[model samples]
Target: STGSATTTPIDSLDDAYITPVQIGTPAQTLNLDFDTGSSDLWVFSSETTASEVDGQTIYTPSKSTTAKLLSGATWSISYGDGSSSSGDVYTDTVSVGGLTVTGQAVESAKKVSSSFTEDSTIDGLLGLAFSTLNTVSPTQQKTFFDNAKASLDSPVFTADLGYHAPGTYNFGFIDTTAYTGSITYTAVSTKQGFWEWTSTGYAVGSGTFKSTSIDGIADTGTTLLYLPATVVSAYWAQVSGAKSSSSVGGYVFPCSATLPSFTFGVGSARIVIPGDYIDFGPISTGSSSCFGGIQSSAGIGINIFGDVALKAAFVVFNGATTPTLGFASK
Candidate 1:
């Protein structure tokens, strides 16, 4: 079963992406990207020099009469890609649609040069995912959600991520109206900074694959699902020689195959991942089998349920309630 867009359409966050909303009686807009790997919302500005900018969209403070730059504050960020940006702190009123969020913290790029900027589509990232990854000295860096939650008439932010769905990266509060039937909720984890999760049990093809069940976490920042390598081999064995002749960087299976159907038991809630996700792409030379969504991560010490797994479900990170992650039935 190939993964089909069951819920809504997915859109790419290109350079023209602008979040517009009304703050008080004034309208404000902010440019942001949907970043799941890390948590933090920062934007670029014209004050940023050419040496400090990549191909990202630069926010000109002069363009907006409501723009406010925080004096004497500075910030810098280093990503997994090894590229980094350092700049001054600033505040601006931002709005998305009829929703208005004000006094949002922004990092004006004073000096930024990284390979991640090679792409013209990305400007700055709005990490609405979970926690904060920005090292801006000030411990409490206001997020897009934090400000939006403070000002929105209805504190809800909903994301309809699928094919053809016009909204992927959304702000504001969660609209319960979009959900169908009943929405299952999960307990909050005690961990800080990371979005941690644990399922009741693991099963394939509708039945429990093994007696030993596993709990896991979901991360959109990651591109692949990384489980134990031994577990990867065992899961592959069930796919009728689904394991390739050689190891690919990740798992790669045929998109057309009738692959295994897996579901996780989260308390009383069981979330399923359609088999189409398993048939990723070839990862290495001399490898015959397509990759599975599950990959080998022996000695990695942590099970990361990446974006491939997350796209299957609608997730909510409620920081107001003990940094817990809540799941709603899609």
Candidate 2:
């Protein structure tokens, strides 16, 4: 069966979107960050120390009769931003939207970094990456989508992430009404356990489009778009008074600066990011400086098309054989 779920942006943190997910028997629901960059479905649970749990909701496996301990198994994960979580494992039923998967491996967190423990809105992360990326020890775990795909009518899901607005994540089916124009398809390589693709190149504002090829990944968990150092420098050069700031940790410019538009190429498709989206709000409260939403992916080894880039298009993450990415104007 096909199912669709609505994702809401966190009011305070416009960086990520959260979706409701039910785990275990009797269905305890949690608002989880649907992260496509990592593969681990973990939550703040009874296993977590009470001192570590602040304002976040906790999941109790004991309350669910269907939860079964995966003895001797454990899982751990760390993100690019240094956020991390680790805990023991359990097997239980997990459901997203209306699709249900039995015997799903659920990682119950025992320890979490300050980046996670301090965030009260998100209880856990629902990984959408390939199962091979799952952090469970001894035996790798499969994601809810991977387990439910075999029972679905179509092995596909669509990400409709909006800018400061609500969107929907659809599983097993692509709603034609959600996007405009035909989807421009590009072949994806999952060699690095990510939705990696090659872009034809990019251009700043209405300037000439460069033909240089860029290798990057489409990551929903990342808040800003990251590109090669040279590429980022080129874009900033086009903006008046914009400069790379070591103190600010990226490029920064005056709040009143008129930024230029940026565009990325996916095969023959041209996905444009408007100037306003580049201004990632003020650097700090009452500060006249603003941080750029696009930054250099230096030392990261790969470029990341994060929310700033993905929200510009309607994306389809095809999980069927020979995975492909479909992009269209929103």
Candidate 3:
């Protein structure tokens, strides 16, 4: 059987997507960030201290008959942006959309960083990365997709990320109408517990697609498309008065600048992102300075094709016997 869920942007910038998830017996529904870049399904719960709680919903396992504490199991995770959460573990009946998984490991956060607490729009995160990346100790836990695959018609899930509106995530089967053209399949290197793939090259606007091997992870958790500084510089050069800013960090430019579309090659397929998406909103409300969606991955060890890039296309995280990534234009 197949299961699907709608993802809505939590912020005007489309910084993250939130989906409804039901946990426990009585089914406490919480809005969770579906992050494909990380592994560890954690949530704000009754165990969370008020100091770390804002307006986010809390998952009370005590009210659920199926809730079982995972003895001696604890998990902690920190993201690239410094947002972090850590807590004890519980196994309970968890469902997303119509798919239900019994004994799903749910990390109950006792402490969350200010970054998480401040963003009350998200109650927790549902990790979609490899289970090997799970932070649970004593015995690591499987991610929702890993545990639900057996019950699914196929061990695969597709990402139909949206630009401004809500999108859909389908499990078990791909929706033929979700994308256009044939999906270009690529081998995924899970050596780092990520959906890492190689882009043949890229083109800024209508420029030629340079033949270069740009390796990166298709990260839904991330907000921007980060690439080599040289490549990023090439894109920003086309925009007038756009330059690297020390005060704001990264590249910033006039919001009214005429931005050009970005295109990246997946095999022979060329996926294009409209220039409007790269504008990435202003630096501040009523501010003239705007952040570029395509930034330099200089110090970052790996490039990330975040929502900025993923939203322009359809992506399939194939967790079959041999994991691979599938990309298709939408």
List per-prediction Cα lDDT, in the order shown. Answer: 0.56, 0.89, 0.93
Q: What's the TM-score of every candidate structure?
A: 0.74, 0.97, 0.99
Comparing 1 with 2 on lDDT, the higher-scoring candidate is 2
Clashes in model 2: which pairs? none
Give the per-residue lDDT digits (tens) of candidate 1, residues 44-142: 668767765666567777666766767777777786536677777667765545444557776677766655456444566665554455566664576
RMSD in angstroms between candidate 3 and the native structure over all alpha carbons: 0.8
> What tens digits encode model 3's per-residue C-alpha lDDT throughout 241-288?
999998888899898888999999898888999999897878888999
* Best of the candidates, lDDT: 3
After aligning candidate 2 to the native by TM-score, how far in Å is the CA of 130 from where it should be? Answer: 1.0
How well does candidate 3 score on lDDT at residue 218? 92
**Candidate ranking (TM-score, best to worst):** 3, 2, 1
What is the Cα-based lDDT of residue 149 in candidate 2? 87
The superposed Cα distance between candidate 3 and the true structure at residue 22, in angstroms, equals 0.9
Better of 1 and 3 by TM-score: 3
Candidate 2: RMSD to truth: 1.1
Error of 1 at 92 (Å): 0.7
